[PDB]
């Protein structure tokens, strides 16, 4: 069972400071999966993002579920430049699923 | 009709570690028909729409006809580690009291 995954922006909150961009991964089995973040197509380095352990789905038994959130500043987002989250998982034909936000979003 | 079921998510601890931000995470599930509101109070007080992120409903995988969704809270790891609470506010025609609402803290 491939990962859903599901890109939320930062608050619209006028930041003054850090944003936030949460990447939600869901609905996966086996609970492997690896999670890396692009701007403008680009790696970011690990330094600013955090993936959690994938955990048990809760209300999807049999299903994990992680998080990864990446950090950056208000500058960054603010630039309209794209960002993506991109999970690698066995269960998809083509290995690979992302989603992009950029502040229009 | 059915009314949402909530799971009021804590923040990761492996992202507590880094003491900068704290988020969490509201997941509503199960409902039908898929008109919803759902939001975050907190300190007694509904959070204006610009302070959160929440999706519009989706079909939920295994169970057509049925939706789900979820909405996200980002604090900083001081405030969530000084015993701040929060509460998702979830509104369903389904609820007979109409809002059900669920809170968390560092506690759980």
Redesign the interface.
């Known amino acids: 069972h491939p990962p859903?995954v599901?890109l939320?922006?930062?608050?619209?909150?006028?930041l003054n400071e850090?944003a936030?961009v949460?990447c939600?991964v869901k609905?996966f089995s086996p609970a492997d999966i690896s999670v890396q973040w692009l701007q403008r197509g680009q790696l970011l380095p690990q330094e600013k993002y955090?993936?959690?352990?994938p955990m048990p789905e809760?209300?999807?038994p049999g299903f994990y579920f992680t998080?990864s959130?990446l950090?950056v500043t208000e500058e960054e987002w603010n630039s309209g430049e794209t960002y993506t989250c991109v999970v690698g998982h066995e269960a998809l034909p083509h290995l690979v699923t992302e989603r992009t936000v950029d502040k229009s979003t």
Do not use: W
Not at 8 to 14: G, K, N, T
């Open positions: 859903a599901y939320l922006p930062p608050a619209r909150e006028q850090s936030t949460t939600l609905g955090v993936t959690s352990a809760p209300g999807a998080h959130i950090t």
